[PDB]
């Protein structure tokens, strides 16, 4: 029944503050350590900061030495960070881990980790273009010209999910992502059966369903 | 601080073959010492403990041993579900390091890509642009060369690619390749065209399309 939680991430300027959340359940934090590990994309991981809740003892990188503050609430069984003085460097998924058995068993249980953006760029949701056709036909839609991660797509509201290839999104030299999405069908299918792509940008409150037809 | 040096950066190996991965910690680091496992988009998750320790639920192909300041994750036989990014981790002081860590492919025999070109949406036109896709579907090995000819002219710096991490089922690869034109410069063209280079291919393969046609 162990599990971390972490809450508090997303958008935040250059500069700013931001207090990440990690709630602990299944085991009293005042038993462990707990830890902040990132990780920058397309990077490895790096340990951010260490807590022991019970008397408040912390140990910190030296990258984020001064800016950042972890901590922790026994009786809520939870732990913060409190990042300061943002950097684009500090950009990265955040996750909550803890020591088992006291070190011996390492960082056993890690949460899903909470996605943190420093920039100075605004929200913009995605136009959705279709990728007309023209396992025999390919077909798809182009998601461009949004900001920040993440866009999640969906075919067919998940009817179609064989086949489905949703690529990587990659910054353009706008500074701003696009990815497509595709989908190889028979080609029998190209004139009557529909095909909708499901597009949500949660960041920008944008959702989209675009139809698809040869 | 101590540096956990890590080999290789990546490999690949056909599913059933032994695997080696080997971390060289800077100085004496005792068995305080852990291997994580990452696939894409998830957390880190705990496979090896003290050196040499199998964590609960993980397979018992996964093991870990200990020699000096060199630690080694071993994988007896590899699966598909295997295919992940490791990490060497030692915590015998503060602050606790992670090795580079080293991706874990799995090899299969050479598939040539399944190639289709998408010109523009007459939507996207309006706004006054035109993106061009080319997509090279489920192919192996993972190198690839696509290079755009307009009007059978070498175009250069104008396209960015993406591909999909390895899949689950067939091990293969697709790549995406995308054209970006103002309509202006787009509608000064004729004939718009991806040729792929690929292992799996005799000969280069195009596909393209006549603007308006
Ligand atoms: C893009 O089409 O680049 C090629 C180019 C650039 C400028 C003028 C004409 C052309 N023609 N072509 N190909």
């Known amino acids: 029944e162990v599990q971390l939680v972490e809450s508090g991430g997303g958008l935040v300027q250059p500069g700013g503050s931001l207090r990440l959340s990690c709630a602990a359940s299944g085991f009293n934090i005042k038993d462990t350590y707990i830890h902040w590990v990132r990780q920058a994309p397309g990077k490895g991981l790096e340990w951010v900061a260490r807590?022991?809740?019970?008397?408040?003892?912390?140990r910190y990188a030296d990258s984020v030495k001064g800016r950042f503050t972890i901590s922790a609430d026994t009786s809520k069984n939870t732990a913060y960070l409190q990042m300061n003085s943002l950097r684009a460097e500090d950009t990265a998924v955040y996750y909550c881990s803890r020591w088992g058995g006291d070190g011996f068993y390492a960082m056993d249980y890690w949460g899903q980790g909470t996605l943190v953006t420093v920039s100075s760029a605004s929200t913009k949701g995605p136009s959705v273009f279709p990728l007309a056709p023209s396992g025999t036909a390919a077909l798809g839609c182009l998601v461009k010209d949004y900001f920040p991660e993440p866009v999640t797509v969906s075919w067919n509201s998940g009817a179609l999910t064989s086949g489905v290839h949703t690529f990587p999104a990659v910054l353009q030299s706008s500074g701003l992502y696009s990815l497509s999405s595709v989908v190889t069908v028979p080609s029998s299918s190209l004139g009557t059966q529909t095909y909708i792509c499901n597009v949500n940008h949660k960041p920008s409150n944008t959702k989209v369903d675009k139809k698809v037809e040869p | 601080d101590i540096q956990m040096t890590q080999s290789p950066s990546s490999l690949s190996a056909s599913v059933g073959d032994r695997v080696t991965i080997t971390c060289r910690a800077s100085q004496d680091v005792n068995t305080a010492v852990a291997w994580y496992q990452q696939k894409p988009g998830k957390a880190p998750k705990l496979l090896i403990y003290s050196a040499s320790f199998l964590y609960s639920g993980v397979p018992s192909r996964f093991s870990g041993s200990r020699s000096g300041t060199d630690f080694t994750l071993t994988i007896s036989s590899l699966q598909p579900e295997d295919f992940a990014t490791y990490y060497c981790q030692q915590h015998y002081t503060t602050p606790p390091t992670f090795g580079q860590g080293t991706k874990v492919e799995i090899k299969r025999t050479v598939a040539a890509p399944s190639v289709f070109i998408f010109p523009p949406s007459d939507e996207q036109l309006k706004s006054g642009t035109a993106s061009v896709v080319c997509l090279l579907n489920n192919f192996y090995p993972r190198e690839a060369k696509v290079q755009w000819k307009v009007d059978n002219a070498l175009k250069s710096g104008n396209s960015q690619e993406s591909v999909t991490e390895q899949d689950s089922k067939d091990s293969t690869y697709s790549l995406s390749s995308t054209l970006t034109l103002s309509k202006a410069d787009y509608e000064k063209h004729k004939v718009y065209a991806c040729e792929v280079t690929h292992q799996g291919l005799s000969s280069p393969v195009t596909k393209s399309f006549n603007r308006g046609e």
């Open positions: 807590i022991y809740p019970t008397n408040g003892y912390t």
